Scaffold this active site. Structure first.
Site, PDB file in Angstrom:
ATOM      1  CE1 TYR A 294      19.315   7.213 -37.143  1.00 32.46           C
ATOM      2  CE2 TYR A 294      16.872   7.529 -36.908  1.00 32.46           C
ATOM      3  CZ  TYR A 294      18.145   6.933 -36.451  1.00 32.46           C
ATOM      4  OH  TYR A 294      17.999   5.885 -35.624  1.00 32.46           O
TER       5      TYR A 294
ATOM      6  CG  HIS B  26      19.267   4.740 -42.072  1.00 31.32           C
ATOM      7  ND1 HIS B  26      19.424   5.852 -41.271  1.00 31.32           N
ATOM      8  CD2 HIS B  26      19.445   3.630 -41.384  1.00 31.32           C
ATOM      9  CE1 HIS B  26      19.721   5.377 -40.163  1.00 31.32           C
ATOM     10  NE2 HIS B  26      19.749   4.166 -40.047  1.00 31.32           N
TER      11      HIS B  26
END
Ligand SMILES: [Cl-]
Length: 276
Positions: A211, A252
Site C-alpha cells: 500500500y 511500500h
C-alpha cells in the site's frame, strides 16, 4: 472545477497524457458523512492492508466518528474560494539539513507535514508554518493549535482510535503502544478518504507494493487540494542516505514512488527541491 491563476495549474489537461490518464477530478480526498459509503471491492481491499482480525462495522464506526469530528467538511478544503492555492509538501529527509528552505516553505498558503516530524529548532531549514499534518495512531505527535490533523486510516481501529483519543482514552495499543489521548481539538480533525488511498494505489502507484506510503499519499492529496505544489524533504540526501532531518520489505515501493514524483516534476506538475 475552476482554472487557477498561478503560473501553471495542476488540473490543466493536455499537457501530459500520462498525467491525464491518472488524475481523476471527481475524487474526494477527505471523508464526509455524505461520501462515506465504500463500494464492496474498495472496502475489501482496504481491510486487507493490515488485516484486523474482526473489525467493528464500518458504518457504525463512521457514524460515531462524525458525532465527534466534523462530518461536512469541503472535500477540497474550500479550494473554490481562492484562485491560486500554493502548497509546500515537506517530507522527512535529512536532505533538508542546512538546506535553508524555511523562508520559502513558509511563503506558501498551505504547508503540509507528516509523521512525528518537528519544526521546532529546525525552522531555518524546514519552515515554522504548518497548515495540515498527516498522522496515524502509530505515527503521531501533538500538533500546534492552528494545525489541521489529517488522520490517514489504514484499518478500522485507526478510526476508533481518533474517537477514543479525543474522548475516553480507552485504546492504548494497536499492534504497538499508541497515545491513549491527544490534545488536538475535535474541530481541527480531517480524515483521509480510504477510497482516495485506493485511488493513489491503483492509479498513481499502479499497484506497486502492499500500500502507499504517507509520502506519496501526501503528494497526491496535494495535487487535488492545491493549484501549485512544491516538494521539500523527499528522497535521499546527496550521499545516498535515508535519515530523518531531526534524528526494503515490499510494503511500500519507494523506488516507484520516487519515480512518480520525478515524472511529475519533469512535466512541471510539481517542483522538487532536492536539498543537500
Ligand atoms: Cl458516494
Amino acid at each position: 472545477y475552476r482554472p487557477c491563476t498561478c503560473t501553471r495549474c495542476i488540473e490543466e489537461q493536455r499537457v501530459s497524457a500520462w498525467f491525464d490518464e491518472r488524475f481523476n477530478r471527481s475524487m474526494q480526498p477527505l471523508l464526509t458523512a455524505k461520501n462515506a459509503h465504500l463500494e464492496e471491492d474498495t472496502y475489501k481491499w482496504w481491510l486487507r492492508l493490515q488485516r484486523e482480525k474482526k473489525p467493528n462495522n464500518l458504518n457504525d464506526t463512521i457514524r460515531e466518528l462524525f458525532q465527534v469530528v466534523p462530518g461536512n467538511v469541503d472535500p477540497l478544503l474550500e479550494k473554490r474560494l481562492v484562485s491560486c492555492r500554493r502548497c509546500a509538501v515537506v517530507g522527512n529527509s535529512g536532505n533538508l539539513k542546512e538546506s535553508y528552505y524555511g523562508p520559502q516553505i513558509d511563503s506558501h498558503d498551505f504547508v503540509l507535514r507528516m509523521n512525528k516530524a518537528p519544526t521546532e529548532g529546525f525552522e531555518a531549514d524546514v519552515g515554522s508554518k504548518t497548515t495540515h499534518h498527516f498522522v496515524y495512531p502509530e505515527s503521531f505527535r501533538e500538533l500546534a493549535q492552528e494545525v489541521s490533523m489529517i488522520l490517514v486510516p489504514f484499518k478500522t481501529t485507526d478510526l476508533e482510535w481518533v474517537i477514543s483519543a479525543t474522548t475516553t482514552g480507552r485504546i492504548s495499543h494497536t499492534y504497538v503502544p499508541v497515545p491513549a489521548k491527544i490534545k488536538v481539538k475535535k474541530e481541527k480533525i480531517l480524515i483521509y478518504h480510504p477510497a482516495f488511498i485506493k485511488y493513489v494505489f491503483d492509479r498513481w502507484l499502479q499497484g506497486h507494493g502492499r500500500y502507499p506510503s504517507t509520502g506519496i499519499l501526501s503528494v497526491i492529496f496535494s495535487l487535488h487540494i492545491c493549484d501549485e505544489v512544491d516538494l521539500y524533504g523527499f528522497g535521499a540526501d546527496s550521499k545516498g542516505n535515508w535519515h530523518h532531518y531531526w534524528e526494503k520489505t515490499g510494503v511500500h515501493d519507494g523506488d516507484f514512488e520516487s519515480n512518480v514524483t520525478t515524472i511529475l516534476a519533469s512535466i512541471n506538475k510539481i517542483r522538487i527541491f532536492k536539498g543537500r
